[PDB]
């Protein structure tokens, strides 16, 4: 059969040969460099945590993930930022458990 290039359908469009160049250097912003990770961990070891995230670490220590997520979702903003901050507080709290372990 003949498969003509069609304007509609799941593989629609005029068929062109997609070249592959490296992505532009504007695109890499906020990739975590190891030096800024070092600076940021040093700053956190200087100054510690905020009160809302301390209260969220108490809720995560008692392992109430739903109310901890609702708490961070209120006091930060979007649900995406809520999930990300809940999981980095879970990583911080796990590192504290391992520090108390050995």
């Amino acid at each position: 059969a003949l498969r003509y290039p069609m304007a509609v359908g799941l593989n629609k469009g005029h068929k062109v040969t997609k070249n592959v160049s490296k992505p532009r250097h504007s695109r890499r912003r906020g990739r975590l460099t190891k030096h800024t990770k070092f600076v940021r961990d040093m700053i956190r070891e200087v100054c510690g945590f905020a009160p809302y995230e301390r209260r969220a670490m108490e809720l995560l220590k008692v392992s109430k993930d739903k109310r901890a997520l609702k708490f961070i979702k209120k006091r930060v903003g979007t649900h995406i930022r809520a999930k990300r901050k809940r999981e980095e507080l879970s990583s911080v709290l796990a590192a504290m458990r391992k520090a108390a372990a050995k």
């Binding site: 003509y4 290039p5 069609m6 304007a7 629609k12 469009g13 005029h14 068929k15």
Partner: protein
């Protein structure tokens, strides 16, 4: 020209074409299209039916470029190509059939309205109709899609 209008013939006549009993007052029925529901009801029912009210879905950020697909008919399909292609195709006995690219002409969709003359064609369109395609097939010819 104000030489030819009506206000020249209406000098001397006291009311100037607007009556003595009901004068030419300023706005006796409201400004503009006012009183649509209330006191020009009979005009907006007898002459503009369907005017008040909502119907249909709201499309917010509309783009005619997205919804662009103009049409040609089979009746004027052979307009798009010059006359010597028709007469060479009819003159030809080898069975070779000319190719009408309608997108080069600028019409995206072939519709089938009229009679199409009995010559084999290859109509290279973007979209087709069922009757346009089956008239092309019944004359003998092919329907080629191009995105």
């Amino acid at each position: 020209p104000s030489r030819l209008r009506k206000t020249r013939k209406l000098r001397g006549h006291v009311s100037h074409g607007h009556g003595r009993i009901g004068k030419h007052r300023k706005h006796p029925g409201g400004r503009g299209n006012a009183g649509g529901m209330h006191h020009h009801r009979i005009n907006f029912d007898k002459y503009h039916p369907g005017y008040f009210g909502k119907v249909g879905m709201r499309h917010y950020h509309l783009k005619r470029n997205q919804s662009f697909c103009p049409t040609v008919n089979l009746d004027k399909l052979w307009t798009l190509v010059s006359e010597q292609t028709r007469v060479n195709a009819a003159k030809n006995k080898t069975g070779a059939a000319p190719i009408i690219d309608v997108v080069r002409s600028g019409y995206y969709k072939v519709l089938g309205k009229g009679k199409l003359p009995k010559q084999p064609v290859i109509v290279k369109a973007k979209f087709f109709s069922r009757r346009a395609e089956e008239k092309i097939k019944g004359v003998g010819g092919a329907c080629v899609l191009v995105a």
